[PDB]
C-alpha cells in the first residue's frame, strides 16, 4: 500500500509538471496545439516545429 501510494503521488506530480510547462501562454510539450511555426524569412516563410506531448 505504501508503494502504491508513492506511485499515485508521483503520477499526479508528473501530471502537474506537464501542466506547468508553459512560456508566455504557449507550450510545445503539454499538447495544447499540434505544432508551432516561427519566422524563417522576411517573406513569412515558417519554421515548423511539431509539438511533442509529454
Amino acid at each position: 500500500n505504501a508503494l502504491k501510494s508513492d506511485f499515485d503521488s508521483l503520477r499526479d506530480q508528473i501530471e502537474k509538471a506537464a501542466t506547468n510547462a508553459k512560456f508566455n501562454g504557449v507550450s510545445i510539450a503539454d499538447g495544447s496545439t499540434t505544432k508551432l511555426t516561427f519566422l524563417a524569412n522576411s517573406d513569412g516563410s515558417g519554421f515548423t516545429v511539431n509539438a511533442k506531448t509529454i
Binding site: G25, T37, F38, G44
Partner: protein
Amino acid sequence: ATAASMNAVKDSLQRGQSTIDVALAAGDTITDLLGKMKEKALAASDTSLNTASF
C-alpha cells in the same frame, strides 16, 4: 517681348519643382511607415504569440 516672356516660364518650372519636393518628402515619410507596417505584419504572422501581443 518673346524673350521677356520667359520669366513666367521659369517661375512655373520653379513652382513645379517645389511641388515635387513636397511630394518626395511625404513619400519618404510614407516609405518609413510602410516599412514599420511590414515589420508589424511579420511579427504578428508568428503563431506562438499570445492574444495580448497580437
